Amino acid sequence: YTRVVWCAVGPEEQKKCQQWSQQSGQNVTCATASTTDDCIVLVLKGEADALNLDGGYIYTAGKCGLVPVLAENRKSSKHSSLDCVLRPTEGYLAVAVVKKANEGLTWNSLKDKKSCHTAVDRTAGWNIPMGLIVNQTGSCAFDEFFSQSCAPGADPKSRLCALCAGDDQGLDKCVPNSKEKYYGYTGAFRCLAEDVGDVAFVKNDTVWENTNGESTADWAKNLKREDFRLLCLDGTRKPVTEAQSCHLAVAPNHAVVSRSDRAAHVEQVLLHQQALFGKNGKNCPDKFCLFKSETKNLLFNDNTECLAKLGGRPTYEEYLGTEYVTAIANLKKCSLEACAF
Numbered sequence: 371y372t373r374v375v376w377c378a379v380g381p382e383e384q385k386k387c388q389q390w391s392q393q394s395g396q397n398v399t400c401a402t403a404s405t406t407d408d409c410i411v412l413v414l415k416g417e418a419d420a421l422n423l424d425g426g427y428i429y430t431a432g433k434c435g436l437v438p439v440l441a442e443n444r445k446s447s448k449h450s451s452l453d454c455v456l457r458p459t460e461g462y463l464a465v466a467v468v469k470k471a472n473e474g475l476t477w478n479s480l481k482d483k484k485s486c487h488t489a490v491d492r493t494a495g496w497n498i499p500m501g502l503i504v505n506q507t508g509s510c511a512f513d514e515f516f517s518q519s520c521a522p523g524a525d526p527k528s529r530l531c532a533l534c535a536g537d538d539q540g541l542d543k544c545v546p547n548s549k550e551k552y553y554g555y556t557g558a559f560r561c562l563a564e565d566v567g568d569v570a571f572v573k574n575d576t577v578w579e580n581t582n583g584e585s586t587a588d589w590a591k592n593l594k595r596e597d598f599r600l601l602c603l604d605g606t607r608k609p610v611t612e613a614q615s616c617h618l619a620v621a622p623n624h625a626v627v628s629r630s631d632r633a634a635h636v637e638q639v640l641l642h643q644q645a646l647f648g649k650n651g652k653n654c655p656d657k658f659c660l661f662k663s664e665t666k667n668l669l670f671n672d673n674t675e676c677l678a679k680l681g682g683r684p685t686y687e688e689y690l691g692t693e694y695v696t697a698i699a700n701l702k703k704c705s706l707e708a709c710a711f
């Protein structure tokens with residue numbers, strides 16, 4: 371029983387994984403794939419046990435029988451009394467961010483502008499934004515809405531990958547793993563921060579964590595929060611301090627998924643591992659920390675306080691909520707119950 375195999379997506383996650391595997395005395399081992407979809411396949415086949423996923427992928431995995439096990443949980447003011455592990459999850463805000471200096475750019479004039487997306491099929495980076503654009507546009511030709519973009523996971527020869535940079539050497543352009551410079555919440559923001567794009571589809575937390583010296587990275591050093599603005603759906607523009615009233619949607623937290631015949635086992639090992647390398651672990655700070663990786667969100671988001679039990683032992687639809695499942699369904703009919711593998 372007692373040994374779990376984690377699936378890392380890309381070289382960087384594999385590096386962090388190997389370290390975790392070592393510090394765990396092999397209670398956790400690693401498997402590597404080039405993409406999130408391939409990691410899902412390895413789990414299906416039973417060659418890997420689990421991995422943490424953005425809601426967009428939880429949906430894909432769910433149609434294939436995988437189940438949400440434990441979810442990421444970040445610090446909250448309200449719901450201060452209960453422990454992190456038993457507290458319900460709040461969800462994150464998906465926002466559209468722009469440069470203040472780009473005066474006059476509103477939600478209603480995004481057509482033909484340049485965009486930065488975390489990656490195709492993800493909640494805040496893709497499903498929410500394109501789901502809304504398809505809807506208001508009446509068209510499915512969402513590949514022709516922005517003049518150019520960087521949407522990791524699309525066809526490299528297409529304009530949707532036009533703005534992506536690849537790795538240190540230009541290799542791997544547009545792959546949906548961290549080797550791509552503008553991949554994920556951080557890459558998408560960098561894409562905008564460096565003015566590669568006009569708008570970026572990330573989450574509220576990303577702006578705060580890479581501005582006002584929160585990120586020591588070279589491209590974020592000098593970034594100032596007041597030089598950014600959120601795009602609201604009412605065609606208005608607000609300070610990043612107002613995400614509560616200028617977001618596109620509230621997304622369900624990323625969560626660890628596994629095959630159901632493995633969940634009980636994955637869950638148990640994870641909570642113990644968490645007591646060891648979690649936020650207040652026996653060994654986190656001194657030897658190793660699961661939720662740390664220098665602004666890179668490798669394996670887990672850097673702002674995870676802990677992985678929380680779920681309660682209501684929800685199926686994937688319940689976890690994602692009727693709201694969002696419906697959003698994804700309506701967008702996917704443009705590309706209807708699957709196991710899309």
Ligand SMILES: *[C@@H]1O[C@H](CO)[C@@H](O[C@@H]2O[C@H](CO)[C@@H](O[C@@H]3O[C@H](CO)[C@@H](O[C@@H]4O[C@H](CO)[C@@H](O[C@H]5O[C@H](CO)[C@@H](O[C@@H]6O[C@H](CO)[C@@H](O)[C@H](O)[C@@H]6O)[C@H](O)[C@@H]5O)[C@H](O)[C@@H]4O)[C@H](O)[C@@H]3O)[C@H](O)[C@H]2NC(C)=O)[C@H](O)[C@H]1NC(C)=O
Pocket residue numbers: 445446447448450463574575576578579584612613614673
């Ligand atoms: C967008 O995304 C942003 C990034 O994730 C996010 O900002 C982050 O928010 C968190 C919290 O939401 C900030 O963390 C907090 O920072 C402070 C100082 O840096 C830390 O120190 C304290 O922590 C205490 C623990 O919660 C906290 O007490 C809380 O609980 C009490 C009692 O229940 C309650 O207090 C009330 O205060 C009154 C004061 O006079 C008092 O009279 C009244 O009776 C009552 O008791 C509050 O609920 C209170 O919050 C202290 O207040 C301090 O926070 C703490 O460790 C914590 O980490 C992050 O710093 C911030 N990140 C960054 C980089 O800015 C935004 O919130 C997101 N935006 C939206 C809208 O979602």
Ligand SMILES: *[C@@H]1O[C@H](CO)[C@@H](O[C@@H]2O[C@H](CO)[C@@H](O[C@H]3O[C@H](CO[C@H]4O[C@H](CO)[C@@H](O)[C@H](O)[C@@H]4O)[C@@H](O[C@@H]4O[C@H](CO)[C@@H](O)[C@H](O)[C@@H]4O)[C@H](O)[C@@H]3O)[C@H](O)[C@H]2NC(C)=O)[C@H](O)[C@H]1NC(C)=O
Pocket residue numbers: 497498501502505692693696697700
């Ligand atoms: C893009 O555009 C598409 C197409 O319009 C859009 O999909 C549409 O989204 C609507 C909203 O999600 C769907 O309507 C839903 O509303 C009814 C009511 O649901 C609820 O709210 C009440 C009141 O708050 C709650 O009490 C209740 O919990 C419901 O959740 C849904 O069904 C209701 O269910 C209750 C019981 O739970 C019944 O008593 C009622 O009779 C009623 O049936 C309904 O099933 C929908 O979920 C609308 O269906 C949907 N259109 C299509 C064709 O799918 C996308 O949301 C847009 N995407 C984006 C990204 O925005």
Ligand SMILES: *[C@@H]1O[C@H](CO)[C@@H](O[C@@H]2O[C@H](CO)[C@@H](O)[C@H](O)[C@H]2NC(C)=O)[C@H](O)[C@H]1NC(C)=O
Pocket residue numbers: 372393394395397642643646
């Ligand atoms: C690997 O898993 C085993 C099982 O949890 C861990 O061994 C237990 O550790 C606790 C604390 O040391 C002991 O009280 C138990 O008696 C141990 N034996 C069991 C339950 O089989 C071990 O700590 C784990 N190793 C790491 C580094 O995570």
Ligand SMILES: OC[C@H]1O[C@@H](O[C@H]2[C@H](O)[C@@H](O)[C@@H](O)O[C@@H]2CO)[C@H](O)[C@@H](O)[C@H]1O
Pocket residue numbers: 461684687688689690691692693695
């Ligand atoms: O697929 C149904 C699940 O929805 C989850 O929550 C949604 C809810 O449906 C919607 O009405 C609103 O309340 O927002 C929630 C998302 O934050 C339920 O919590 C889950 O139990 C299912 O019923």
Ligand SMILES: [Fe+3]
Pocket residue numbers: 424425492493494621624
């Ligand atoms: Fe996400």
Ligand SMILES: [Zn+2]
Pocket residue numbers: 617619620
């Ligand atoms: Zn809202």
Ligand SMILES: [Zn+2]
Pocket residue numbers: 682683684685688
């Ligand atoms: Zn249920």
